[PDB]
Structure formats: C-alpha cells, structure tokens
C-alpha cells in the first residue's frame, strides 16, 4: 500500500549547560529505524531496525555527516530565533524539524515535507507544491523572503522527489519481511459494573501494525453512539500498537450495543 519516510529532530538549548541537545529519529511508516543523539556516547548515526545493519560503513559515514550538519544549522537557528522573537540567552528553547516523503503502492512520489516549529508553534513550512514557503508569524517572513530570493526550495525539491523516494524504496525491499507486513488486531472485550443500576464494557485491539485503527461503536444497530470514552493509540513496545474504547450502557442492554473494529490486517471489519 502507500508508504512514508520521516525524520523527526528536536533541538533544546541548555543555557550555561553547554550546547543545545540534538536528538534525530527516522521512521519508515511506524518503524524507528535510525537514531542520533548529541549527548550519547556513539556520536554517530545508529541503527534501530535489523534491516538497516546491512548498509555498509559508507552509509553510516555519510548519514552521521548530514545529521551533524543539521545539528549545526539548528544550533545556528536557535540563536537566530532569539533575535527574531526578541528573547534572552538565559531561556531554554525548542526547535523541531520534520522532513520526509510519501510514496504510493508503486513506490512513486506522492508528497514531500520540510518544516520547522519554534517553541512548539509552527515557524516556516514547505508548501504542498514544493516551490514556496508558509511563514506562520511575522519573524518567519524574514526567512521566507531570503529563501524565496535564493530559490532554496530547489535544494529541498531534489531531495524529496529524488533521494527521499529512491532511499525509501530501497528500505522497503531490504526490509520486505517486517515493513510490508500487516499484523491484524487481537480482539478482546471486558465488562465491569458502574454502580449496580449501571455498567461499563470496553473492547480492545492489541497486537496490530500499522497504528491506523477505528474503534467505533453502535447502539441497537444505529451508528449514533458518540458519547464514547476513546483513548490514544499506544505502543506495546514489541513494535505493535493497541487502542481501547469503553462505552457506558443501561444495565440489561449490555448485549444490545455492538462494536466495529476497522484495520487493514482484517479483510472485512470485526463486529463484537
């Protein structure tokens, strides 16, 4: 099916406590496959999936190089941000960066991303077209104008339509076994009493991959059962994800209410 590559990197300044910490992570869909941490012993790009170890020392030499450079640009960018937002050195600030590409079933380019958020709020983002920028506030406008004049988006376009897709395709082959897989959700169902004249019953999905799941309920065959207590998709730790949705019912109508589980590991959805 469709696939995606993403690199998520965070830079947090530590005024007087050295140089801002740089943590960079790479994913193929929901699989952390690479790691970079400035404070870590290694001081190199590290593997996080078995299928990336088959890459020679040349890969790890280059990948360590690019990431230590990105680390410097964002070090540079955090000092600049203080100037643009009229802030002090004494404060600790966050600079996050996200970049990647989406590809279809055929492993061909679909979308590209190149974006920044300073202090948890958007700063500048690369447009769907891959040619212009989205400068959120007033300060980013100064960055957008210089980058548009210099035609910087082209350096990014060449990566996203080229190297990003070419590289993601290569990962999808080498890691065919684990990455192309679709672990269906291991269906569960529990029942507990609210206060004698009321009761609660929740269903669970537990051993699935990817993180895409729909735990929607139904009362008396009607889709109308929106007053549900739904939780956020959480990682089991063994490379699989889980989610649950608890619905309160009038004691004696526990059997009247059905639950519909939507996932790609199941050809037809599951009703409980």
């Amino acid at each position: 099916g469709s696939h995606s590559m993403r690199y998520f990197s965070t830079s947090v300044s530590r005024p007087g406590r050295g140089e801002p910490r740089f943590i960079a992570v790479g994913y193929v869909d929901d699989t952390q496959f690479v790691r970079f941490d400035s404070d870590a012993a290694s001081q190199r790009m590290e593997p996080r999936a078995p299928w990336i170890e088959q890459e020679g020392p040349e890969y790890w030499d280059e990948e360590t190089g690019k990431v230590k450079a990105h680390s410097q640009t964002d070090r540079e960018n955090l000092r600049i941000a203080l100037r643009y937002y009229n802030q002090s050195e004494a404060g600790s600030h966050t600079l996050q960066m996200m970049f990647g590409c989406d590809v279809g079933s055929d492993g061909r380019f679909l979308r590209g991303y190149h974006q920044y958020a300073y202090d948890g709020k958007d700063y500048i983002a690369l447009k769907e077209d891959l040619r212009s920028w989205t400068a959120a506030d007033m300060a980013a406008q100064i960055t957008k104008r210089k980058w548009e004049a210099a035609h910087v988006a082209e350096q990014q376009r060449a990566y996203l339509e080229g190297t990003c897709v070419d590289g993601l395709r290569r990962y999808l082959e080498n890691g065919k076994e684990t990455l192309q897989r679709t672990d269906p959700p291991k269906t569960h169902m529990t029942h507990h009493p609210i206060s004698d004249h009321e009761a609660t019953l929740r269903c669970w999905a537990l051993g699935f991959y990817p993180a895409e799941i729909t735990l929607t309920w139904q009362r008396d065959g009607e889709d109308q059962t929106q007053d549900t207590e739904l939780v956020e998709t959480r990682p089991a730790g063994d490379g699989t994800f889980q989610k649950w949705a608890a619905v309160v019912v009038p004691s004696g109508e526990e059997q009247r209410y059905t639950c519909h589980v939507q996932h790609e590991g199941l050809p037809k959805p599951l009703t409980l």
Binding site: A24, T73, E76, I80, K146, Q156, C164
Partner: peptide, 11 residues
Amino acid sequence: TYQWIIRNWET
C-alpha cells in the same frame, strides 16, 4: 537517507 539541512534562517 537524511537530507542536507545546511542553510540557516538568516541565510
């Protein structure tokens, strides 16, 4: 494959 992020906000 990581990208070359070699241009700062002021360049």
